Design a protein around this nucleic acid. Structure first.
Ligand code: MG
Ligand code: MG
Ligand code: MG
Ligand code: MG
Lengths: 212, 211
DNA sequence: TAAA
């Protein structure tokens, strides 16, 4: 019963959703979005954060989108692969947005916040695509994010995803980079570990005096 | 400074706190009006604290847009004679110079912008640096340390005024939106978050966490 | 929903 967990209390009513995108370049406005995965989070009985629902979509390049060969070489994606099962930006985001809104309502939150590694990257691609497909009721905060690079820099003294995960004691496999799914799952587990560690060490909840 | 732990704390990144004031939300089209920068240092006990402060009022670039709602919000009159405004180039060149000195003196490799909802300030600083064709920009081209996310983790608060108050800091509504004051509160906030994690034993890491 |  999500309403009954502390999820909504932990981040002032923000519902954290982990996102990774794969793309055909670095420019959210002109380069194709090719893949997206999303993982909602939940808080267990002891107040530990953990992954909840996972969504994963392969995305058809938008009308007029550019595709940089270096990007494709990097993520190893072939936009014309039959087994891609590519759907439109609209269907992918619409399905993600539906599940996220459901989680928001079920948990007693008020909106979603994107958790991502160098989060401005994914946030911009996700916003540009939502703009393209004219999605409304976008549950994500229009500008605020939870960047795991910054968070790992604080908690672990590491900003690089693979290194942060290793330092946190997670396995990280260079072969499995870069499915959107694998990177999203490692980023979710990393983020949960950072928040849980903070609770472990007594940093949260705050003391009485810290009530203002 | 190379004998402090500053360069070891963030894998060679030299943290610089930044706040800009602007005539709108679009880094590409709206004027950059003001910017402050605060470098950090570690004391002998390993605590982070503000080091050098810089503060510039900025002349709107050629063709820049000025949204009235932004002016109303930040209280800035671009034509106030007392502004002592300088060009984007002069401001960023001076900021960049002092940051490059700090990097070399502390033994770091790159600077990383600390800012509140940092993509905002990072975008304007980068846009301006591009327009003025500044060279050897010491800031990481895409990585930031967002104090909104950091405060969300450390304090359960993402709004700057609230984060600060929660952390036991003063925060004054009247002083808000001078770049100087916002930068100073943001620096003190960021240092408190880092210092708190150290106080609680979160840093340094244990032996097992060494890879 | 607070980076102007
Ligand atoms: Mg990524
Ligand atoms: Mg990836
Ligand atoms: Mg600001
Ligand atoms: Mg301000």
């Amino acid at each position: 019963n999500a309403q009954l967990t502390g999820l909504c209390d932990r981040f002032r009513g923000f519902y954290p959703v982990v996102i990774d995108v794969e793309t055909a370049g670095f420019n959210a406005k002109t380069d194709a979005l090719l893949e997206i995965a999303a993982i909602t989070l939940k808080m267990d009985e002891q107040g530990w954060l953990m992954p909840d629902t996972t969504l994963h979509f392969h995305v058809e390049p938008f009308v007029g989108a550019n595709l940089q060969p270096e990007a494709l070489a990097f993520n190893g994606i072939d936009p014309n692969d039959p087994d891609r099962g590519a759907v439109s930006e609209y269907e992918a985001l619409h399905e993600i947005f539906k599940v996220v809104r459901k989680g928001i309502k079920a948990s007693g939150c008020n909106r979603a916040i994107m958790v991502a590694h160098n989060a401005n990257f994914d946030h911009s691609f996700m916003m540009a695509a939502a703009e393209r497909a004219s999605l409304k009721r976008n549950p994500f905060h229009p500008f605020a994010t939870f960047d795991t690079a910054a968070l790992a820099g604080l908690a672990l003294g590491q900003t690089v995803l693979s290194k942060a995960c290793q330092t946190a004691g997670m396995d990280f496999d260079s072969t499995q980079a870069h499915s959107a799914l694998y990177d999203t799952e490692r980023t979710a587990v990393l983020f949960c570990e950072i928040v849980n560690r903070w609770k472990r060490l007594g940093g949260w909840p705050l003391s009485a005096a810290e009530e203002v």
